[PDB]
Amino acid sequence: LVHVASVEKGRSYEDFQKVYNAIALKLREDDEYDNYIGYGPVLVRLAWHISGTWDKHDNTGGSYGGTYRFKKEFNDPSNAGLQNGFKFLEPIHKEFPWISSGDLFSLGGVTAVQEMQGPKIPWRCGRVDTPEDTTPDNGRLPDADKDAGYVRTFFQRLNMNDREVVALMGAHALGKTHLKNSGYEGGGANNVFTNEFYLNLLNEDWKLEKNDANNEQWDSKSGYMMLPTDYSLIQDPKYLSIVKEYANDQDKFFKDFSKAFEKLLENGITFPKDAPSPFIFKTLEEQGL
């Protein structure tokens, strides 16, 4: 099972930069969402969830086919709340209907990270919408009530190693959990991409508590939370070392996250030898827009 990247006919960097800019301008405009967090974090969650269905063993799932647009995946309990991201992207897709769904969903995550002052994430076009019967079944995204061993094993399916896992989890500096979506509450309201996730893990006074949905979570005196899978990153000695590294090296974190996140978004895609090089989009700020 091979998914070959196919550039939307006639499109080049500038076409995609326009799509990036439209997302970025809407991000700036729609600032009220989720108690003024805005849509950046949910767009990053969306890009991860459309990608995180991938299975290296048979190359099913992944971002390529845009299958989040179909009911089965759209309604996955693991995707609760992502409908807000889909609705945000809908007018963008109406403006640029030439773009494939997988390209749009993944680009929305890239744009969100960058516009939230994160690292540049190189991005490649050419995901092709596939039919409804290619939609992966629910249950491929990870549980949050698990330990480090679960995390490590889960991410092997996505071909991610320890460093890649710890780096990817840094995205949890963004946004928050919502009890109605996932059965967890809290996380603050941060919408700037930093290494704060790791600093919070190492520096806060955490206490394990059972929330109003009957799930365990770690809560700090200062009002932050960690999922058990987040906290596992300081319980396992291998993960802890990497957590310390990123807490003490912002640039290293940025660079590792960028590589892991592009890899996450490209898992399952075969890029032909004469495919365009990855695009590095300018932010609105860099454009003076």
Ligand X SMILES: Nc1c(Br)cnc2ccccc12
- What residues are designated binding site? 45, 48, 172, 176, 178, 181-182
Looking at residue 199, its amino acid is L
Among the candidate windows 24-32, 133-141, 224-232, 234-242, which touches ligand X by CB under 6 A?
A: 224-232
SS3 166: helix
Residue from 62, 65, 108, 175 touching ligand HEM (CB under 6 A): that is 175
Among the candidate windows 11-19, 94-102, 116-124, 168-176, which touches ligand HEM by CB under 6 A?
A: 168-176
Nearer to ligand HEM, 182 or 250 (CB): 182
142 binds ligand HEM per the rule CB under 6 A? yes
45 binds ligand HEM per the rule CB under 6 A? yes
Distance CA 49, CA 226 (A): 19
Distance CA 108, CA 209 (A): 34
226 binds ligand X per the rule CB under 6 A? yes
Q: How far is the CB of 251 from ligand HEM (least distance, A)?
A: 18
Name 260's Cβ contacts closer than 8 Å, sequence gap at least 6. Answer: 160, 163, 164, 167, 168
281 binds, among ligand X, ligand HEM, none (CB under 5 to 8 A by kind): none
226 binds, among ligand HEM, ligand X, none (CB under 5 to 8 A by kind): ligand X
Nearer to ligand HEM, 54 or 261 (CB): 261
Q: How far is the CB of 16 from ligand HEM (least distance, A)?
A: 21
Q: Which two tokens stand for residue 24?
A: 């970025």
- CA distance readout (Å), 65 to 2, 85, 248: 11, 18, 38
Residue from 81, 122, 186, 276 touching ligand HEM (CB under 6 A): that is 81
- Where in 120-179 is the site for ligand X (CB under 6 A)? 172, 175-177
Dihedral sign from CA coordinates of 227, 229, 232, 234: negative
- Where in 82-141 is the site for ligand HEM (CB under 6 A)? none
Name 110's Cβ contacts closer than 8 Å, sequence gap at least 6. Answer: 20, 47, 121, 123, 261, 265, 281
Which of these, 62, 51, 66, lies nearest to 130 by C-alpha position? Answer: 66
Nearer to ligand HEM, 93 or 176 (CB): 176
- CA distance readout (Å), 284 to 18, 27, 28, 63: 11, 11, 10, 25
Q: Beginning with the edge strand found earlier in the chain, give each strand of the sheet holding 206-210 in spatial order.
A: 206-210, 216-220, 225-226
Distance CA 184, CA 231 (A): 14
Q: What are phi and psi of 120, to 5 degrees?
A: -65, 135
Q: What is the contact mask toward ligand HEM in residues 203 to 232, using x (rule: CB under 6 A)?
A: ------------------------x-x---
Q: Which helix (H) or strand (E) holds 220?
A: strand 216-220
151 binds, among ligand HEM, ligand X, none (CB under 5 to 8 A by kind): ligand HEM
Q: Which residues are annotated as a binding site for heme b?
A: 45, 48, 172, 176, 178, 181-182
Residues that bind ligand X (CB under 6 A): 172, 175-177, 187-188, 197, 200, 224-227, 230
Residues that bind ligand HEM (CB under 6 A): 41-42, 44-45, 48, 81, 142, 144, 151, 168-169, 171-172, 174-178, 181-182, 184, 227, 229, 261
